[PDB]
């Protein structure tokens, strides 16, 4: 089972100082880099947090606040980071915007509100596993597969595209639309220019909807450029385009539950508003956030310290694997990289994959995940985090890799 | 429409120093009494609201924090706190409690675990009207009414309860369970005994489950005393037993989104846990309850207080309305009277109940609930809320009403 290298760490979980041994956590895509950003503002601004405002108690009101239309001055201060993490070369409509329990709830509601029990959506491979309970567990919405293959270095074409709409048409599915991940979980890529103007040539000539799950876009930290989805449509398929946000992993606030649905379709923020019922964000956290959001010094600060630091680990994680004899896909986003190991594997198939895997869960004792969990169609990828360990942690982890491709290799 | 209340209201909402004949709210089940207590312990006990515990920053720790099973500190101050409200006499295992995004979240995560689509649910009447959302729009369960009816102050008998699962049959639906509210919206009564040991015969009879939502719980004023359902299960069957909670009724809390689901089946309590990830609860509102739950001086006082001021603001309600020849049912819980105003209706028809509704809005210039609106089978009767007004304000709409029928009665 993919289980097995979470199982194993929770058994024995690596710490410095009590227990060196154990197992380095690189499974889990979480930001801890620019905590003393937050942490800092947060010393120097201590009213939001107090339920104060213009020294004044307000309490009560965020209380009572359960509007599902959220917090005015959060949304306002929501879309205006999410036009600066596009460097303003877009502007989101606060009232096209919708909060939600995270980009966790915000996918599932996008689910609901654009297909039916029985249905399909296409989803390039490899992609982030939790998609297969979040869009499909209580929706009862199926996921049909566009493969993406290392040749051209996981990039979405037009006959892989067309590949996946047969096959919903082989298993009797009437597709809905593509959910699509910029930049991408596993991939550590941005989308290009170029595979976004074919998904909406796509999607027009199919007459679906677009997806794009944009949780990373502050998180791009090397060339090439981020491009939002919402950018190329300024250069009808205008209704079907639709993101997900959320501060879950550029901010590093995954337990705060922020996220994001927007869409152009008026419907569609009607419906996904009346929805978000059953997961609003704490008006607490809300308020909170709003007042974080809202100065434009930090939002400054932090958008180009992340991408210092992002792209510092993510340097080191890349050299410390090319002294293994180990090579990447070559990145430029995300919390991870996408790591080839196809040459360490004892035959091209999934079963020696699960075995590597197996051996760096048990030998080096570190946890990875296999290109298997994320439906990678090539056996011997695996996604590797960076922005959760300290620096000499990740050394560590590399220091263990380096001995165990020496021996066995 | 039902919404035409609350249409006028939001046009021209009541203002004692800025439009004195403004609509007063008495629709919303808002608890406004007891802020000051909240407040208050907020000034003494500044900690938990700043991110620090033991003097040290937890932002970090906390804002990392995203785990389905909820933070153990404020799981355990949860089920303490529905201990005491239920006067110690059952306690709750923790690890059976699962948090939500309010009971919003809550009942529809019920249903999801327990009914498949175009199967139903019973549920008296009259009844929350939020329920016709939350538990049949995304879960494609049908709800089938339990009819009660005033001849026994609205009580369910095993008659209405074996009409409910015939009617669900000439519908062709099989039943799944049947879902209560006790204390009782919208009727501000707590649920007999006997009505409890009816409930549980009846599903025990017929295999199915029962839930009671218990958000009122800490609410009940007055005799009789509050008994919750799993009470009278110390005194098969208890495998399907379930209990739904949330803070926003009794704390008035509803903007923090905390709900709870209470299951003694480890099953449930699984897939209710893994359903959580889609309306989790914000890490930064479960640390600050779990500091201001875990205060037994503050739970004690707060549920003493609440009690109090509840029960002033009620007799408050009931006589004013008396003063006008209107009598309620006799209740004793929850932020709301059911009230009697048969006499008032031109005829004893919908059609008249919506009449003397509009005349209400429009003339007396108050918002208050039609009985239609919560499936009443009777005309004539209208939920008032009581809990959110300045005593000042319900006493002005007291005097407002008494006007209204001296005129046109």
Redesign the interface.
């Given at each position: 089972s993919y289980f097995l290298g979470w199982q194993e760490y929770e058994k024995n979980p690596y710490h410095e100082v009590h227990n060196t041994n154990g197992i380095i956590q690189m499974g889990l895509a979480?930001n801890?880099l620019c905590?003393d950003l937050?942490?800092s503002w947060?010393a120097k601004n201590?009213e939001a947090?107090?339920?104060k405002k213009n020294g004044e108690?307000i309490?009560?009101e965020?209380?009572?606040?359960?509007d599902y239309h959220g917090l005015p001055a959060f949304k306002k201060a929501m879309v205006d980071f999410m036009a600066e993490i596009r460097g303003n070369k877009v502007t989101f409509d606060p009232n096209h915007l919708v909060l939600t329990?995270?980009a966790?709830?915000a996918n599932?509601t996008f689910i609901?509100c654009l297909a039916d029990?029985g249905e399909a959506v296409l989803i390039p491979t490899p992609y982030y596993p939790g998609f297969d309970?979040?869009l499909k567990?209580?929706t009862?919405v199926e996921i049909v597969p566009i493969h993406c293959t290392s040749s051209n270095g996981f990039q979405i074409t037009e006959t892989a595209l067309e590949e996946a709409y047969q096959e919903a048409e082989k298993r009797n599915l009437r597709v809905k639309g593509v959910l699509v991940t910029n930049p991408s979980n596993p991939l550590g890529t941005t989308m290009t220019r170029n595979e976004l103007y074919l998904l909406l040539s796509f999607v027009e000539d199919k007459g679906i909807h677009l997806i794009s799950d944009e949780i990373y876009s502050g998180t791009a930290f090397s060339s090439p450029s981020f491009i939002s989805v919402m950018e190329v449509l300024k250069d009808e398929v205008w209704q079907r385009v639709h993101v997900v946000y959320s501060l879950?992993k550029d901010l590093?606030?995954?337990?705060?539950?922020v996220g994001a649905i927007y869409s152009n379709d008026d419907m569609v923020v009607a419906a996904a508003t009346?929805?978000s019922?059953?997961?609003?964000?704490?008006?607490?956290?809300q308020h909170?956030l709003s007042a974080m959001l809202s100065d434009k010094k930090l939002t400054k600060n932090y958008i180009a310290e992340n991408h210092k630091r992002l792209k510092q680990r993510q340097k080191k994680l890349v050299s410390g694997l090319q002294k293994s004899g180990i090579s990447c896909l070559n990145g430029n986003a995300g919390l991870f990289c996408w790591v080839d190991m196809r040459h360490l594997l004892r035959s091209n198939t999934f079963e020696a994959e699960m075995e590597l895997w197996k051996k760096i869960v048990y030998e080096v004792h570190l946890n990875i995940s296999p290109g298997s969990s994320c439906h990678c169609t090539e056996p011997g990828w695996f996604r590797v985090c960076f922005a959760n360990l300290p620096e000499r942690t990740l050394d560590l982890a590399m220091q263990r890799l380096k001995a165990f491709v020496g021996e066995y290799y």
């Open positions: 979480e801890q905590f937050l942490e947060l201590p947090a107090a339920f108690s309490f009560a965020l209380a009572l606040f359960q329990a995270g966790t709830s599932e609901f029990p309970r979040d567990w209580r009862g879950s590093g606030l995954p337990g705060f539950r009346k929805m019922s059953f997961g609003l964000v704490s008006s607490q956290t909170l």
